[PDB]
C-alpha cells in the first residue's frame, strides 16, 4: 500500500542489508511497500540523486538509511519535496526527523567492559571517518576511555568490512603495537582483526580481546564467538517503518529518536594476558620446526 | 537513464546483496538505473507481487535474482508482460533467458578436492531444498560422490544462514555422525559448519575438514580460511546487466547461459588421519614465530 | 616573452613536478614566462576552473598535464577560449592537440622483459583507474600478458604514491598471493612495494622480481635500483614549449604527438628459479636462530 | 575570492613542491585563489624576476619559497611593490615576514642523537652553501657537534637531490674516509647517501647510519625506512596562508615566526659497532628461511 523509498548505503555491507530487510519485513505487516535505491557512496550529491529517482516513483515516504555530515542531511532532506524524510544514519543533534541508536551507550558498554575485566592498553579501530557513526563512536570510546582516566595506544581505521579489519590490525602488529584489547567498529572489522591476531600467532581473548559493534547475524558465530554491541536492526525497521507512516499520516513527530543498543558478552573478551612467550619459548617451538623440517 | 528491476531474494543473505551490488556497479558505468524489490522466501506468489510492483516503475526490464522451480519460473516470466526478464537463480534447463553459475563443476571440484584428499567419510549441508540451486548442488555431490565410489555418511540441509549450519552439524554429531569432511552449500553455512565441529573440541581441517561455496566476501577472514568453490557474482552482475539491455534492444541471446566456478583452496581442508605436518604448514608456523619473534 | 600557462595535476607526485620544471627550462631558453596552476583532482570541472584561471591570467597559451578522460579532454579544449592547448595527459585517441607517451611500448617493454626471464607469476599494481594513463597502462599489461598466454596472479591499484604502492602490495602478501614478479604503473609506488617485500623477509629481484614506469629522479640509486619503463620528461617540457610557441607562432602542428619511452635495466629484475636447499639443510638453518633467539 | 601568488624554486625537489601543495589546499579553504611561478638557482636577480612577473598578475599577496641571504630578502621583499609578502626560505633573523622552522633544535636534535648512540666518526653531507637553510644547519650541526667535542671526519657538499647525496657520499667513501654515522641536508640526498653506502658493500644503519632532514613523503618508505627531523609543510603551508591574508588586511604580525621540528626515528639509525643481534633480523632470516620450507 503505503510505498516507501529506501536510500540504502551499501548492501554489500551486513547492517545496511538487514536493516533494508527489517524495513521490508514491518512494511509487509502494515501492508506498506518497499523500493529500495543504492546511493553510488559518495556523499550528498549521491545520496541526494538516489532520493530524486526515488521521488519520481511515487514514493509516498522516505527512509535514508545512509551517512550523512549535518550539513549534507538537512540538504538531502531539504530535496524530498514535502515528502516525509526519515533519516537512519545521521546524528542525534540533526534538525530532521531521525531514528537512531544510543552511540554514548554503545561506546559506554564497550569501554566499561573492558575496563571492568582489567584491560589498560587498548587500540580503537574506527570505521571510515567520513561516517557520521564512524566518527560518533571514535569520539564515545574517546570520552568514556579517558573517564575511565585510559588513553587508546593505538587508533586506525577501516572501512567496515573484514579485509580492512585485517589490514589495519596487521599493520598495527607490525609496528609492535600489541594492545591487550581492541574496540572495533562493526563486527564485520573484528572478524578481520580476529583474522590478523591469529596469524600474528596471538589467540583472540586469552592474548587480544575484541570487543565488535553491531551484532550482525554471522557473529554469535565467528572464531572464537564476538562479544558486541548489539544494535536490533529489527527493531529500527519497526519503528522507522511505523514512524514514516505516522509522518506520513500527518502523525506530527518531528525529532530524533535513540535506541536502546546492548552489549552482548561472548568469546572474544577475556581480561588482560600479563604473560608472553619468552625467547626460551620461542627458541623451543623453533626447535621441533627445525627438526620437523629436517625430517622432510 | 533506463531502469533495471532487480527481484532479489532476501538480502539478508551475502550472495544475494553481493549479486545485487555487482549489479548496481555495471548499471552505474552505463548510466542505467537499477531500483530493487524484495521477495518473501514463498515463491511464484511472492516473486509475482514483486515482478508487478517493478512493472509499476516502467523499468526498461526485470533481473530476477530469485530461486524459481522450471514450472514457476515460467509463470513468473509470462507476468513481466513484454518487458524482457532475466533470471538468475534457477536450472540450466527452464525455457527462460537465464544466466547460471556451472553447479556440475562446482559439485565436481568440491567431491574430487575431498577424495583425492583422501576422504571417505563425507556429509553433505545442503540449503533449503526449495531453492533449485540448492537442489542442483546437492543431486550434484550425489553424481560425483557416487561415481567414485563415495557415499555420504550424513545429509543435513539448513537454510543458507550460519545458524543453521552450525544447529545442523551439532545436532549431526551429537547423533554420533562424525564425518572427516564436510561439503557445505554455501560459505555461511560452512562458517556455521566450523564454528560447530570447534564447538564439540575439533579443530577444522585437521579433524573435520569443511568446503564451501560462494567465496562471498568475507569466506577467507574466518579461521581457518575458508577454502571454497568461487562464483565471481562480479562477472554475474556485468553479464546480467549487458544481456538484460541487449534483451531491450532485440539484440538477445535468449537461451540460458553458463558462467564458471572455481576452487579456492585455502586452510579449512586436509588429509584425514594426518599425524606430522606437510611443509607450506612448516612455513605458516615457522612465520607466525617469526612474526612473535618480531615483536620482541 | 609569451606567457605561457600550465594546469598541472599533483606536484606532490614526481613526474608532474618533473614536467613543470622541464617546461621551465624551455620557456627561459626561448624567452616564454610560465605561470602554474594547480587542478584540485576532481576530474573536468576541477580542471576547467584551472584553465579558468589561467585565461583570466592573460595566457597565451595552455599546456593541461591533468588526467583527462577523452569527453573532458575535448571539454576542457572548448574552455581555452582563443588560445592553443596542448594536452599531456590524455589518449592517443582524441582529436586534439596532445603529445603524449606510448604505452604500447611501455607496457610491452616491461611485460616482455618480465617473461623473459621466465616469470610466470605477475602481479600488476595499476595507478588509479580515475585515470586515463592509468587505464592504458593497465590494458597493456594486459594486451600484451595474453599474447604471451599468461594472465596476472592479482592486480590492484592505488594513488600514486609509495604509501599505496607499500599498502597494496603489503596488502596482496598479506593475503598470500605472493608472485615471482610485479609490473608497477609508476616508480613512487614501486618504491612502496620494494619497501612492502623486503618487509615481509622477501628478497627484492632475486625473489620478488618489480618493474616501475616512469624512470623519475630518485630510482636510480632506490634500494635496489629500479629497473624502469623510461619516460623522458626534460623532452616532454621542450616539445610542449617549442609547439605550444609555434602552434601560437602560427604554425600548423594540430594532433598527438607519441613520445618514445624505453626500458632502463637496473637491479629490481632477475630470474625466477626456485632453488629449495635441503630440509638437512634449511633445518640446520633454523636451529641457528633458535640459538640466535635463545640468546636474546 | 582573492589570489596568492607564489614564487617557488625547483618544483623537482621534493620539499618545494610540497609546500606549494600545502599552500593550495589551505587557500582552497578560505576561498583564495593560488597562481605559482617558478625560480631559477640565480638568486637575486631570478627571484626579483619572478616577483615582478605575479606583480603583474594583479596578485593580492606573495609567498617566497625561494632561497635568500638577508640581502637578497630584503631586495626581494622591496621588490614585492606594497603588496604584501612572506619569504619560508630565510634567516630567522632577516627583518622581513617570515615562517621558518628551528633550524636550531634539528641540527641540536641530529648531533644528539648520534652521539646518544654512540658514533664519533660524524660526517656532514651539507645542502647547496648558496642556501641559506643549507648554510645555517651546517653550522648548527657544527656548534653542537664541536659543543660535543666532535669533529667530523668528513664534510661535504650536494645540492639536494638524490644523486649528488650518491656522488659526494662514493666520493668520500672512495677516498677511505668511512664514517658510522652520517647527518644530511634533507632526505633526498639521505636516499643517495644510502645508495652509496649499499654500492660499497656496507649497511645502513648497521655499518654506516644516516640521518636526514624534512621527513619528505617518500621517507618513511626508503629501504631502511628514514630517520629524519619532520619539518611540518602542512602547518607550513597553513601559517603561511592564514598570516599572508592577515598580513593583508593589515594586521600586524611584521617578524618572523619560527615553526617547531621534530625526530622520526626509523631503521638508518644504529649504535656503532653492533655485536650481532635484532629480533626483526632473526625475525627476518625466518620469514626468508619460511619461504624456502613452503617450496622444499
Ligand atoms: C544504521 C547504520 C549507521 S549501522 C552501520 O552501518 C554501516 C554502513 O553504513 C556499517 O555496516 C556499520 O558496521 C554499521 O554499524
Ligand atoms: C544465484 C544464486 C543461486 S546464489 C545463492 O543464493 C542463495 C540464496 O538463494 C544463497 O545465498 C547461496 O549462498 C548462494 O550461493
Ligand atoms: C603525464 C602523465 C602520463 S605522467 C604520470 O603522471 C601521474 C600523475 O598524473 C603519475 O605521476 C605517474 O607516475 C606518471 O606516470
Ligand atoms: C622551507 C625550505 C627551507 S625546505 C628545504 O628546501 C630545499 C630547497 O630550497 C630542499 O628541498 C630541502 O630538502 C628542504 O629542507
Ligand atoms: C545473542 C545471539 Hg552460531
Ligand atoms: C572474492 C572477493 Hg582476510
Ligand atoms: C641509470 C643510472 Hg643514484
Ligand atoms: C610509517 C613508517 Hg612506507
Chains 1, 2, 3, 4 share one sequence.
Not at 69 to 82: K, L, P, S
Not at 225 to 247: A, E, N
Request: charged share 15%; glycine share 6%.
Amino acid at each position: 500500500s503505503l510505498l516507501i523509498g529506501v536510500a540504502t548505503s551499501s548492501l554489500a555491507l551486513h547492517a545496511p542489508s538487514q536493516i533494508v530487510a527489517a524495513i521490508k519485513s514491518r512494511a509487509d505487516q502494515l501492508g506498506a511497500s518497499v523500493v529500495v535505491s543504492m546511493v553510488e557512496r559518495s556523499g550528498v550529491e549521491a545520496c541526494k540523486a538516489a532520493v530524486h529517482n526515488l521521488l519520481a516513483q511515487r514514493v509516498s515516504g522516505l527512509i535514508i538509511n545512509y551517512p550523512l555530515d549535518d550539513q549534507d542531511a538537512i540538504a538531502v532532506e531539504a530535496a524530498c519535496t514535502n515528502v516525509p524524510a526519515l533519516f537512519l544514519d545521521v546524528s542525534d543533534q540533526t534538525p530532521i526527523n531521525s531514528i537512531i541508536f544510543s552511540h554514548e551507550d554503545g561506546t559506554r558498554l564497550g569501554v566499561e567492559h573492558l575496563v571492568a575485566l582489567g584491560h589498560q592498553q587498548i587500540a580503537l579501530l574506527a570505521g571510515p571517518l567520513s561516517s557520521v557513526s564512524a566518527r560518533l563512536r571514535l569520539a564515545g570510546w574517546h570520552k568514556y576511555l579517558t573517564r575511565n582516566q585510559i588513553q587508546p595506544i593505538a587508533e586506525r581505521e577501516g572501512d567496515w568490512s573484514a579485509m580492512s579489519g585485517f589490514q589495519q590490525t596487521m599493520q598495527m602488529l607490525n609496528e609492535g603495537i600489541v594492545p591487550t584489547a581492541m574496540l572495533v567498529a562493526n563486527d564485520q572489522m573484528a572478524l578481520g582483526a580476529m583474522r590478523a591476531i591469529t596469524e600474528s600467532g596471538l589467540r583472540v581473548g586469552a592474548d587480544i580481546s575484541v570487543v565488535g559493534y553491531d551484532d550482525t547475524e554471522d557473529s554469535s558465530c565467528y572464531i572464537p564467538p564476538l562479544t558486541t554491541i548489539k544494535q536490533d536492526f529489527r527493531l529500527l525497521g519497526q519503528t522507522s517503518v511505523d514512524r514514516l507512516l505516522q509522518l506520513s499520516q500527518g502523525q506530527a513527530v518531528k525529532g530524533n529518536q535513540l535506541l536502546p543498543v546492548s552489549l552482548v558478552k561472548r568469546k572474544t573478551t577475556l581480561a588482560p594476558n600479563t604473560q608472553t612467550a619468552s625467547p626460551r619459548a620461542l627458541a623451543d617451538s623453533l626447535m621441533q620446526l627445525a627438526r620437523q623440517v629436517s625430517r622432510l
